Amino acid sequence: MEAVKTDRAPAAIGPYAQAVKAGGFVFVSGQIPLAPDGSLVEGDIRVQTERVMENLKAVLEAAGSGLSRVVQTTCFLADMEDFPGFNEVYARYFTPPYPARATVAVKALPRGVRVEVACVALAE
Q: Are 69 and 121 in contact (CB under 8 A)?
A: yes
Per-residue b or e along 21-47, where b marks 16 or more CB atoms closer than 10 Å to that residue's CB: beeebbbbbbbbbbeeeeebbeeebee
Tell me the HSE value of 93 on the side-chain side, using a 13 A CA sphere.
Answer: 24
User: Is residue 12 packed enough to be buried (19+ CB in 10 Å), middle (13-18) or exposed (0-12)?
Assistant: middle
Which domains, and CATH codes, for the chain?
2-124 (3.30.1330.40)
- The torsion angles phi and psi of 65, rounded to 5 degrees, stand at -115, -160
- Omega before 15 cis (within 30°)? no
CA 68 to chain centre: 14
Give the method used. X-ray
